[PDB]
Amino acid sequence: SWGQTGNQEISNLARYTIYAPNYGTTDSFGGQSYGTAYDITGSNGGGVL
Amino acid sequence: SWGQTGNQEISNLARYTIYAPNYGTTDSFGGQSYGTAYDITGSNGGGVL
Hints:
SusC homolog (chains A, B); little secondary structure; elongated; part of a larger assembly; 2 chains
């Protein structure tokens, strides 16, 4: 026998350029959350950045 | 016919004295959340009370 089979088993988002808001709400380990929030004002926080 | 039927259809907690933490995380209307959080320190917030 000879024959071929397709395979499409990849990330549903595989085609795309992906930007994510990733404020950084999520457990990391030793930092490197890679979040996009930042205290641009220098207040030290206490509220949404 | 004569006969009787019980009825027990009440709050599952009906028996008890209920204290709830109710920090106050929940939509109210015009206030009266009845929450137990308070800025006892007078900081104006920015962080857990």
